[PDB]
Amino acid sequence: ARPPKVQVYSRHPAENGKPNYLNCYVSGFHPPQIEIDLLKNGEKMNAEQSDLSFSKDWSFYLLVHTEFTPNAVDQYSCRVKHVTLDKPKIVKWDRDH
């Protein structure tokens, strides 16, 4: 058993009003069951999830992604539920990370 590591980021650098993609990359975890959700102002978004894969150390990885058009005030995050976590893990989108 092993907790997930979570990064949230856009595909291209964010320019407000410009079509783009939002990504949540989750990795390092065991066992494989995990719930991952992309959030728009605390709201679940529709998004696709990659086919489960792993790395040489056996730990799992997945990419969750959806289209979005940046901001104004719109806040975005990724939310992850995993057995190793007693509490869900919310990582906030920040355009320069």
Partner: protein, 275 residues
């Protein structure tokens, strides 16, 4: 450079379901190209890249028979793995298998793999010489004994030296435009000051392929470390990758530091500074 063909196989005992779910993904280098999931009612090997779709029916039928094949083996190995550890029927368990060939710039086999992990931990693995097995504990050491008499090592060796390598070449031919592109990073540096305490410079690389890249910060020849944050390389979602390296520097000195970017798709190394 060198290339690889790799399959990543995950079997998960549910166990509030008659069968465990088997998932397989196939990669050339860092690009996924096939998928098998046991939870389809039709379960077949499927394409996950446009350039494999030209394969005809017999390719898909053979792959599907083999994944059907290996799913029933791994299910068997799940049941076997309980008793070799005195284990509870309640709890869910994971079996992972990685196998594939790694090949040099001239097509020689460098490393072949077949290796297994039960709930995240080594279990058994084919050695670099493809003629022997290292078993992680006493449980696996019996599986080894069985694989030794069976000469399954010779079955893997023959696959890894013929099939695996010949198919890798084929895939590199068919997917040429994708898999042999040298696609360079698009780069820029940001600056974020913090009061009168010095300044986070962040050097970015976006849209590159393959995955391998070097981002370092230098001052006066020397690589920097102290408030140096380097993220894990990460998929962009379109086949390309991104990464960044951030450094805290003193106020006023922004231009003494330079980001050094090394990638396969660059004519020569690149040197960036903030302006």
């Amino acid at each position: 450079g060198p290339h690889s063909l790799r399959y990543f196989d995950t079997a998960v005992s549910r166990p509030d379901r008659g069968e465990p779910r088997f998932i397989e993904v196939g990669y050339v280098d860092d690009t996924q190209f096939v998928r098998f999931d046991s939870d389809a009612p039709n379960p077949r090997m499927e394409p996950r890249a446009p350039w494999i779709q030209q394969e005809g029916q017999e390719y898909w039928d053979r792959n599907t028979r083999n994944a059907m094949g290996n799913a029933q083996i791994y299910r068997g190995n799940l049941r076997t793995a309980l008793g070799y550890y005195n284990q509870s029927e309640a709890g869910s368990h994971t079996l992972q298998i990685m196998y594939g060939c790694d090949v040099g710039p001239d097509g020689l086999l460098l490393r072949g793999y077949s290796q297994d992990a039960y709930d995240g931990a080594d279990y058994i693995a084919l050695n670099e010489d493809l003629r022997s097995w290292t078993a992680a504990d006493t449980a696996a050491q019996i599986t080894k004994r069985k694989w030794e008499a069976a000469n399954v090592a010779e079955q893997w060796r023959s696959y890894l030296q013929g099939t695996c390598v010949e198919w890798l070449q084929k895939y590199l031919q068919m997917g040429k435009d994708t898999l042999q592109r040298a696609e360079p990073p698009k780069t820029h540096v940001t600056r974020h000051p913090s009061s009168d305490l010095g300044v986070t410079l962040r050097c970015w690389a976006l849209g590159f392929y393959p995955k391998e890249i070097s981002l370092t910060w230098q001052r006066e020849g020397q690589d920097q470390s102290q408030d140096m944050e380097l993220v894990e390389t990460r998929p962009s979602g379109d086949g390309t990758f991104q990464k960044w390296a951030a450094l805290v520097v003193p106020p006023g000195e922004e231009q003494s530091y330079t980001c050094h970017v090394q990638h396969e798709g660059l004519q020569e190394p690149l040197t960036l500074r903030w302006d």
